[PDB]
Structure 1
């Protein structure tokens, strides 16, 4: 279909196509999947994405974009099952921070409204279907539940709209197939209630049968035209007056065909059944022999010319063998030369390479690759210099030129212009040490990050940074509580470490990653694990405090922005000022003979410390900055 599409060759295929790609079929299947699996992510959004749930006479593009943002939301917040049909609105925050608690911005309200508005047209038809379905006991009342589901979502009207849209675009066949899908489904249901209408069956058996039915569904045969290449088979196809015949895939195991015996009755079952005087269909043994007659009819079908082709390799590169028929043909025609079929024209004669230029696209495609080969110091055919030249003569050579610009393709980045840079990053650059570190790792990464502000799709999943934030915030809460009860880290008992730690993690849990620690039992245990960690760390800090002359001054101290310490600042050739604002984990002061002493402590989740090599290349700057 695709090749003859590209080579502009009209064809008639002797076979019916599947409906398994049609939106209606998938709509029904995925809907039943929503019911069966209790609104799992994949099922629901398969269903939504078939677009049949879309609000009637609303612009599908805009609806799509809304669904898209709902989908990202569901992924990020882990929405599934009861949460869909709960009364509660989906709540939306652009960013949630553990340390600081924030009131909902106005943009967030606008978003939340959109999300919930989209949800409110998704849920009812699906919810009502689920309700009707639990209540329906017999095949007929489940079939009626389902059909009503189709009726209420205005499926026939939407499909008819689709028919017209397609017809306008000229796609007559693709338009014709919508009504086929509908009639097919209706017939399926009709039969089902005809044979089992009054029988009570389970939802699982129902879905199973509906699925089995939809798997067999096929569109009608596209009616033959006045001038088509005929593409068909060797067992059932019949032709007349054929001038030329291509026999394909003459591979071992393929031609002749290995029959599959497997049915209720075995080959030996059938063979014995013959001796007792009962005649059935041909067992595999016979069919394997009749393959010779099939191949005979296939070979003597044309009047003028006959081609017998075979591929040597798989799509995956697995080796395919030529059948016995190729050898047999080599015997009957020992002076006949075998022709090579490749997408590498260099491997054939110039006359054959000339066969490749059949139209502008095919020509463009092959020419570009031939040009590449040429740059690699290889003599490409004259056919391609001729072809290139005609392509450059033709009306829209700019397109062909663009295609051929691959010859000089390099992964180059153009430096940001002064005005663009100024607008993107600002005349004043507010930064963090981490931003600088990112830049020193790779400028482009910093560009995608802090320039374009490209965000990755959020997932309902506890990553490392979230846990880090949890640890930081937890130690902060503990420290604060310690000062509020006139207690010091030294005076902590094991009991107190445990109590405080568990309380702190308890406090912070509902704020951490969309309440993921409350999401399941497994995550409850994750929460307990984290509690145990914080406990031991509390104890450790208590022991370190009893042996250190250094006293913590400020924890999670802020320099720049809101924080008490002023931002360090830099002046540029640009005239721009770069101020950097950040947060030091801990600072300790001590009293000594040399004077007042200050040290910086950072809570990390790795054993590794500070590598001066990484400092020299600007990969590790946070600590020395804090000290500075």
Structure 2
């Protein structure tokens, strides 16, 4: 059907066509599913999208716009089962989401009432029909019938009211045989289900001039000139004895000898194959073509049948031709048989132009074909097609008028947004430029898990201050008591109450709890050791908050007001004066890779530090020096030891798992202020140590105040050089060594598309590179 449609070859097929794809059949099937599987939203929309549930007289266009948005809503909120039966922007939306379900639920809901109600067949069969009629299936169908005719498809228009008759009769016989027998949906549906599978459309009546495509068994022909035989493969043509029915071939074979004759069915059929093959081979008067595919639908190997051999016996000198969609594999003659049609000509000629540029000598039949296609009306269309010849996925730079009205007046920066641009300029354009959104799902993603921990941590503090308590004053008892409550007060209000949706999630609850309980105890131990006391927490950085926005002035009207979030800033008094450090909670293992900072992929902490440092002056009235940047790993660790341990040593190992990674200051004091327990050797709280002399070890992640201001300034330049590029309207696609990847369409084989390499650098190497910048 597909091939001949493209090659414009009129035909006639013996077999009939199933109705399983017809809206009426789908509408019915999915409707029973709706109430059987307890209103799975997938089934509901399966029904609604046969649009037989659609409201009357309301323009279908808008209806589909609403049905789709209702679907998206149900997918993200996991709407199922009972949930169905139970300002400016919000209204418009929610005033649609009610209307939509308001015409969807009742007809389908009132149906389950009548259905689950009725005991016998006829009444369940009746309830079904009334579901069809009250929804005006006939009317809406009849309408569709017209559209089909208006568009030149009467064959398709027939099958509509034709489908109706099939269903009705399906019920009539059903109620005729088992009408007053008692049955409920389980067997009832299954019978209707098998009823659908059996349903068939009327055979399409032959036309005056057609190619006859039929079978090799009971198909009949007359006056045929040319006959093509398909599928001359092994196990196919001399059809392997089919294994079906109630009686085996042994049973029948046996029965014969008792004086009872039945249908052949078994090994006789195989003997009869040669007669049918003989009748097929002698069918044409002029020409006979016998063909067999070498590969398979999926690509498994296929051999010719013994018939091809038997043929090569009677015609030992006959050469066999080769059918291929790769014209270059045949002579110029056959190559001229591909130009049967404009569409097919185009499809092939495009593929030839490709292969030609690959330094292959192509036939001139295609050049002739090219010039013809370029001489007619739709030259443009074929031109766009042939433009594929040289298609490098290329990105036109954003104009000035566009980026100005797109990104806007002020570019209100976000450290993350800058990371995003520095990860791939195009990704930025996709998210912040075009404001694209992913379909939301009822799944609880890893990212929004972290937001829970924060809001729990933030919540614990408030409880502590209320009792005038500090993390240090906590007991193992309270750590659990406090942590659990925090999730109780949060869990319900997180991610569409998904933590309340199922049972697995409410086990994820206590899980999220046990984790918080351990981290709570760790912070306590960390506070009884740390000399750093938290100054500010969840500090409003930029926009509307405690701090001012950090501003950026760059050539060509570049205004960048970037905003952000400072998890924690801690203060410690030293002989060197005031000390400030930042702490951010993470679920990951490591915190800072200097190599990753150079390319501007990790600007988070370093930028947070600067503000604290800079503003520290006019903020509290003192000048601060960077102690460093730290990442706290929130998790419930599992230790792995070959050494048998006592609960004493286990507590230790667990404790060390929370050792903070990051970037410190390289002096003895700062190290001893972050861990006052440490005298000599390794610290378990921070990544640093002390030799006997008092000097810290080389393994320390510490650096001088110089290197800190160096990294700081580098970051400043990164917000700048990357802040201008945005305004300059740069949307280039340059991934490193994504959700928008399907929009990127990045192809490495396709030239001009390159992976900009990132190198793995010993901290000092880049620490040296940034030195050379200025």
TM range (shorter): over 0.9
Q: Distance in 2 between matches of 1:504 and 1:213?
A: 56
Q: CA deviation at 1:573?
A: 1.4
For 1:269-311, what per-residue CA distance to the aligned partner results, in whole angstroms no more than 9, with x for missing partners? Answer: 1111111111110032000110000000000001111110111
For 1:58-78, what per-residue CA distance to the aligned partner results, in whole angstroms no more than 9, with x for missing partners? Answer: 222211110000000000001
**Equivalent in the alignment of 1:406:** 388
Q: CA deviation at 1:563?
A: 1.1
For 1:306-361, what per-residue CA distance to the aligned partner results, in whole angstroms no more than 9, with x for missing partners? Answer: 11011100122111101111111111111211011000111111111001101111
Q: Distance in 2 between matches of 1:561 and 1:481?
A: 28
For 1:216-236, what per-residue CA distance to the aligned partner results, in whole angstroms no more than 9, with x for missing partners? Answer: 111001111110111000111
**Equivalent in the alignment of 1:90:** none
Q: CA deviation at 1:178?
A: 0.1
Q: Distance in 2 between matches of 1:416 and 1:570?
A: 21
Q: Distance in 1 between matches of 2:477 and 2:50?
A: 57
Question: Does the aligned pair in 2 maintain the 1:256–1:291 contact within 8 Å?
Answer: yes
Q: CA deviation at 1:109?
A: 2.2
Q: Secondary structure at the match of 2:288?
A: strand
Q: CA deviation at 1:537?
A: 0.8
Q: Distance in 2 between matches of 1:489 and 1:412?
A: 56
Q: Distance in 2 between matches of 1:370 and 1:617?
A: 43
- Higher relative contact order, chain-length normalized (CA < 8 Å, sep 6+): 1
Larger radius of gyration: 2
**Equivalent in the alignment of 1:533:** 515
Q: CA deviation at 1:44?
A: 1.4
Q: Distance in 2 between matches of 1:223 and 1:161?
A: 24
Question: Does the aligned pair in 1 maintain the 2:116–2:184 contact within 8 Å?
Answer: no
Question: Does the aligned pair in 2 maintain the 1:271–1:283 contact within 8 Å?
Answer: no
Structure 1 unmatched runs, 5+: 87-104
Q: CA deviation at 1:262?
A: 2.1
**Equivalent in the alignment of 2:397:** 415
For 1:351-398, what per-residue CA distance to the aligned partner results, in whole angstroms no more than 9, with x for missing partners? Answer: 110011011111111000000010001111111011111111122211
* Paired residues for 1:38-57 under 5 Å: 38-57=38-57
Question: Does the aligned pair in 2 maintain the 1:560–1:580 contact within 8 Å?
Answer: yes
Q: Secondary structure at the match of 2:231?
A: coil
- The count of corresponding residues between Structure 1 and Structure 2 is 610
Q: Secondary structure at the match of 1:205?
A: helix
Q: Distance in 2 between matches of 1:236 and 1:599?
A: 88
Q: Distance in 2 between matches of 1:510 and 1:553?
A: 31
For 1:468-508, what per-residue CA distance to the aligned partner results, in whole angstroms no more than 9, with x for missing partners? Answer: 00000100011112112211111112222112211111111
Question: Does the aligned pair in 1 maintain the 2:350–2:386 contact within 8 Å?
Answer: yes
For 1:424-458, what per-residue CA distance to the aligned partner results, in whole angstroms no more than 9, with x for missing partners? Answer: 11121012100000111111111111111111110
Question: Does the aligned pair in 1 maintain the 2:349–2:370 contact within 8 Å?
Answer: yes
Query: Is the deviation greater in 328-337 or in 68-77?
Result: 328-337
Query: Is the deviation greater in 555-564 or in 22-31?
Result: 555-564
Query: Is the deviation greater in 481-490 or in 172-181?
Result: 481-490
CA RMSD of aligned residues (A): 0.9
For 1:567-624, what per-residue CA distance to the aligned partner results, in whole angstroms no more than 9, with x for missing partners? Answer: 1111121212101100110000011000100000000001112111011110110001
Question: Does the aligned pair in 1 maintain the 2:31–2:44 contact within 8 Å?
Answer: yes
Q: Distance in 2 between matches of 1:283 and 1:224?
A: 31
Question: Does the aligned pair in 2 maintain the 1:53–1:122 contact within 8 Å?
Answer: yes
Q: Distance in 1 between matches of 2:362 and 2:59?
A: 52
Q: Distance in 2 between matches of 1:566 and 1:138?
A: 75
Q: CA deviation at 1:520?
A: 1.4
Q: CA deviation at 1:82?
A: 0.6
**Equivalent in the alignment of 1:353:** 335
Q: Secondary structure at the match of 2:388?
A: helix
Question: Does the aligned pair in 2 maintain the 1:267–1:285 contact within 8 Å?
Answer: yes
Q: CA deviation at 1:41?
A: 2.4
Q: CA deviation at 1:511?
A: 1.8
Q: CA deviation at 1:34?
A: 0.7
Q: Distance in 2 between matches of 1:215 and 1:620?
A: 59
**Equivalent in the alignment of 1:122:** 104
Q: Distance in 1 between matches of 2:443 and 2:462?
A: 29
Q: CA deviation at 1:510?
A: 1.9
Q: Distance in 2 between matches of 1:626 and 1:7?
A: 66
* Paired residues for 1:245-264 under 5 Å: 245-264=227-246
Question: Does the aligned pair in 1 maintain the 2:248–2:266 contact within 8 Å?
Answer: no
**TM, length-normalised to structure 2:** 0.78
Dislocated runs of 4+, deviation >6 Å:
none
Query: Is the deviation greater in 41-50 or in 324-333?
Result: 41-50
Query: Is the deviation greater in 420-429 or in 41-50?
Result: 41-50
**TM, length-normalised to structure 1:** 0.96
